[PDB]
Design a protein around this motif. Structure first.
Motif, PDB file in Angstrom:
ATOM      1  N   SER A  11       0.737  -1.165   0.066  1.00 28.23           N
ATOM      2  CA  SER A  11       0.009  -0.138  -0.041  1.00 28.23           C
ATOM      3  C   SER A  11       0.952   1.325   0.082  1.00 28.23           C
ATOM      4  O   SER A  11       2.040   1.297   0.811  1.00 28.23           O
ATOM      5  CB  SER A  11      -0.795   0.130   1.262  1.00 28.23           C
ATOM      6  OG  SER A  11      -1.403  -1.152   1.495  1.00 28.23           O
ATOM      7  N   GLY A  13       2.417   4.972   0.722  1.00 28.55           N
ATOM      8  CA  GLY A  13       2.482   5.642   2.005  1.00 28.55           C
ATOM      9  C   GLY A  13       1.705   6.994   1.966  1.00 28.55           C
ATOM     10  O   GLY A  13       0.985   7.153   3.096  1.00 28.55           O
ATOM     11  N   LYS A  14       1.471   7.400   0.699  1.00 23.81           N
ATOM     12  CA  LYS A  14       0.462   8.625   0.871  1.00 23.81           C
ATOM     13  C   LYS A  14      -1.082   8.263   0.690  1.00 23.81           C
ATOM     14  O   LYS A  14      -1.697   8.934   1.488  1.00 23.81           O
ATOM     15  CB  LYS A  14       0.882   9.592  -0.341  1.00 23.81           C
ATOM     16  CG  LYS A  14       0.762  11.038  -0.270  1.00 23.81           C
ATOM     17  CD  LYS A  14      -0.688  11.354  -0.684  1.00 23.81           C
ATOM     18  CE  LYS A  14      -0.915  13.009  -0.552  1.00 23.81           C
ATOM     19  NZ  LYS A  14      -2.222  13.356  -0.650  1.00 23.81           N
ATOM     20  N   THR A  15      -1.382   7.243  -0.162  1.00 27.98           N
ATOM     21  CA  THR A  15      -2.620   6.808  -0.132  1.00 27.98           C
ATOM     22  C   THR A  15      -2.801   5.300  -0.012  1.00 27.98           C
ATOM     23  O   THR A  15      -1.868   4.494  -0.462  1.00 27.98           O
ATOM     24  CB  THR A  15      -3.704   7.311  -1.507  1.00 27.98           C
ATOM     25  OG1 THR A  15      -2.936   6.315  -2.432  1.00 27.98           O
ATOM     26  CG2 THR A  15      -3.445   8.611  -1.670  1.00 27.98           C
ATOM     27  N   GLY A  16      -3.743   4.828   0.871  1.00 24.05           N
ATOM     28  CA  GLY A  16      -3.780   3.484   1.097  1.00 24.05           C
ATOM     29  C   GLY A  16      -4.138   2.347  -0.142  1.00 24.05           C
ATOM     30  O   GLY A  16      -4.569   1.194   0.390  1.00 24.05           O
ATOM     31  N   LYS A  60      -3.537  -0.899  16.382  1.00 21.73           N
ATOM     32  CA  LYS A  60      -2.916   0.123  15.633  1.00 21.73           C
ATOM     33  C   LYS A  60      -1.252  -0.073  16.038  1.00 21.73           C
ATOM     34  O   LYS A  60      -0.971  -0.209  17.055  1.00 21.73           O
ATOM     35  CB  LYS A  60      -3.312   1.336  15.751  1.00 21.73           C
ATOM     36  CG  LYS A  60      -4.948   1.870  15.596  1.00 21.73           C
ATOM     37  CD  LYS A  60      -5.146   3.097  15.229  1.00 21.73           C
ATOM     38  CE  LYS A  60      -6.536   3.664  15.758  1.00 21.73           C
ATOM     39  NZ  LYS A  60      -6.040   4.044  17.007  1.00 21.73           N
ATOM     40  N   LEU A  64       3.487   3.413  12.418  1.00 16.99           N
ATOM     41  CA  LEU A  64       2.704   3.745  11.139  1.00 16.99           C
ATOM     42  C   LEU A  64       1.639   4.710  11.020  1.00 16.99           C
ATOM     43  O   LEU A  64       1.747   5.466  10.068  1.00 16.99           O
ATOM     44  CB  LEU A  64       1.737   2.392  10.841  1.00 16.99           C
ATOM     45  CG  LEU A  64       0.985   2.340   9.507  1.00 16.99           C
ATOM     46  CD1 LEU A  64       1.801   1.810   8.346  1.00 16.99           C
ATOM     47  CD2 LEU A  64       0.031   1.403   9.543  1.00 16.99           C
ATOM     48  N   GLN A  65       0.905   4.973  12.031  1.00 12.10           N
ATOM     49  CA  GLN A  65      -0.254   6.031  12.059  1.00 12.10           C
ATOM     50  C   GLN A  65       0.341   7.524  11.917  1.00 12.10           C
ATOM     51  O   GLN A  65      -0.143   8.160  11.122  1.00 12.10           O
ATOM     52  CB  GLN A  65      -0.846   5.930  13.555  1.00 12.10           C
ATOM     53  CG  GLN A  65      -1.547   4.834  13.563  1.00 12.10           C
ATOM     54  CD  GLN A  65      -2.902   4.531  12.580  1.00 12.10           C
ATOM     55  OE1 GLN A  65      -3.623   5.402  12.229  1.00 12.10           O
ATOM     56  NE2 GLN A  65      -2.735   3.367  12.169  1.00 12.10           N
ATOM     57  N   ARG A  68       1.937   7.610   7.962  1.00 13.17           N
ATOM     58  CA  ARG A  68       1.132   7.902   7.084  1.00 13.17           C
ATOM     59  C   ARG A  68       0.415   9.413   7.075  1.00 13.17           C
ATOM     60  O   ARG A  68      -0.210   9.661   6.159  1.00 13.17           O
ATOM     61  CB  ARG A  68      -0.096   6.815   7.580  1.00 13.17           C
ATOM     62  CG  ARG A  68      -0.299   5.369   7.209  1.00 13.17           C
ATOM     63  CD  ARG A  68      -1.100   5.403   6.128  1.00 13.17           C
ATOM     64  NE  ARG A  68      -2.282   4.107   5.882  1.00 13.17           N
ATOM     65  CZ  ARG A  68      -3.220   4.304   5.437  1.00 13.17           C
ATOM     66  NH1 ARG A  68      -3.688   5.049   4.572  1.00 13.17           N
ATOM     67  NH2 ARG A  68      -4.155   2.972   5.454  1.00 13.17           N
ATOM     68  N   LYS A  71       3.757  14.195   5.573  1.00 16.66           N
ATOM     69  CA  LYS A  71       4.783  14.340   4.417  1.00 16.66           C
ATOM     70  C   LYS A  71       5.183  15.656   4.589  1.00 16.66           C
ATOM     71  O   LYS A  71       4.559  16.724   4.864  1.00 16.66           O
ATOM     72  CB  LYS A  71       3.613  14.109   3.216  1.00 16.66           C
ATOM     73  CG  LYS A  71       2.911  13.007   3.164  1.00 16.66           C
ATOM     74  CD  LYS A  71       1.231  13.316   2.496  1.00 16.66           C
ATOM     75  CE  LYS A  71       0.296  12.417   3.027  1.00 16.66           C
ATOM     76  NZ  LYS A  71      -0.921  12.979   2.774  1.00 16.66           N
TER      77      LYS A  71
END
Length: 360
Positions: A11, A13-16, A60, A64-65, A68, A71
């Motif tokens: 997936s 990093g920017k969009t799932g 979770k 990661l959270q 995600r 940026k």
């Protein structure tokens, strides 16, 4: 071994959204108890780091959270993430694909220490500028790094960019929640942390960057404490003894203990004679006992120290032009519209947003 391509569904990093990625030539860079780090090559000839951690599928991932929701030109980049199966159901692993690390401010500094010369003054400005901006950002989104130190500053010797690296010990600070006091590498541990405060704020990352800046000018750590308690002594040996009001703001319970009296041996004397008086001033306003008294992440950027970068006349000792420093977003500036005048020099104004409030 052998040399072989391995494909897996991941997936972005920017969009799932799901996209296949492939990589090869991976081996370990470092081994912690909470993650193995692989150095691999992403199929295109882009070198990467993959962090493989154990993850309880019942909740979770701290790390990661954040990756995600983060940026910025000066943080690291989560390319892809993918879930690797342990055996069958017994466990599950989470793999993070992160842009590779050419070098670090630390190894950069070590390089100059071989050549017995301290690292160029302008380079310090450029590196510290990028870090502070990087902080100003993550802080605005509520994230405390809790590990700002030379080793965790990604560097690129040709381009001269800095990227904040290693969000492994980072935590988003929700008001009124207690947090571990024994945090940060010792030298860069804020004093309120040595006083065992558990209600601290992002201001601690600021303290650390002060210890980082100093270290770059000193060629050696500012407070080279040998243990927990010693670290607080090394600090008093320079800053002086904390006031009643000072120890009050750090931790109200430790505000009575008996402490030796030593006078604030001024910075103007602590650094080499050739040291710019603006650099002295900045460090002085970052290294305060009271967390609130420290210049905030953005405020520091507006220090006279960072004017030599705003003219657009300065160049690297490399000879090259300097990296993006002014490509601001609406989000970035909206944290403090107050100080929009300093952050944007007129020479880059020709873009968007303009002079209208434009607050987000």
């Amino acid at each position: 071994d052998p040399n072989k391509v391995i494909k897996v569904l991941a997936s972005d990093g920017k969009t799932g959204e799901q996209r296949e990625i492939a990589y090869t030539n991976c081996k370990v860079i470092g081994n912690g108890s909470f993650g193995v780090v692989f150095q691999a090559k992403l199929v295109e000839s882009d070198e990467v780091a993959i962090k493989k951690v154990l993850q309880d599928k019942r909740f979770k991932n701290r790390e990661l959270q954040i990756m995600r929701i983060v940026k910025h030109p000066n943080v690291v980049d989560l390319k892809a993430f993918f879930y690797s199966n342990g055996d069958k159901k017994d466990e599950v692993f989470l793999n993070l694909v992160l842009e590779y690390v050419p070098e670090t401010v630390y190894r950069a500094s070590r390089h100059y220490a071989k050549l017995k010369q301290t690292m160029p003054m302008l380079l310090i400005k450029l590196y510290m500028y990028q870090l502070l901006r990087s902080l100003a950002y993550i802080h605005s989104i509520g994230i405390c790094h809790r590990d700002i130190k030379p080793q965790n500053l990604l560097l690129d010797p040709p381009s001269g960019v800095l990227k904040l690296i290693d969000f492994g010990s980072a935590k988003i600070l929700i008001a009124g929640e207690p947090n571990v006091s024994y945090i940060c590498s010792r030298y860069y541990r804020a004093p309120e942390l040595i006083f065992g405060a558990t209600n601290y704020t992002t201001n601690i990352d600021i303290w650390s960057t002060g210890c980082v800046m100093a270290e770059l000018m000193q060629g050696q750590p500012l407070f080279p404490g040998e243990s927990g308690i010693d670290q607080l002594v090394e600090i008093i040996k320079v800053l002086g003894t904390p006031s009643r009001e000072q120890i009050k703001t750090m931790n109200p319970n430790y505000m009575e203990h008996k402490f030796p009296q030593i006078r604030p041996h001024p910075f103007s004397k602590v650094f080499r004679p050739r040291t710019p008086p603006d650099a002295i001033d900045l460090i002085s306003r970052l290294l305060e006992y009271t967390p609130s008294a420290r210049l905030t992440a953005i405020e520091a950027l507006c220090h006279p120290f960072f004017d030599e970068l705003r003219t657009g006349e300065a160049r690297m000792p490399n000879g090259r032009e300097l990296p993006p420093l002014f490509n601001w977003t609406k989000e970035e500036l909206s944290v403090r519209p107050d100080l929009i005048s300093r952050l944007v020099p007129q020479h880059a104004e020709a873009e968007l947003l303009s002079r209208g409030i434009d607050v987000h």
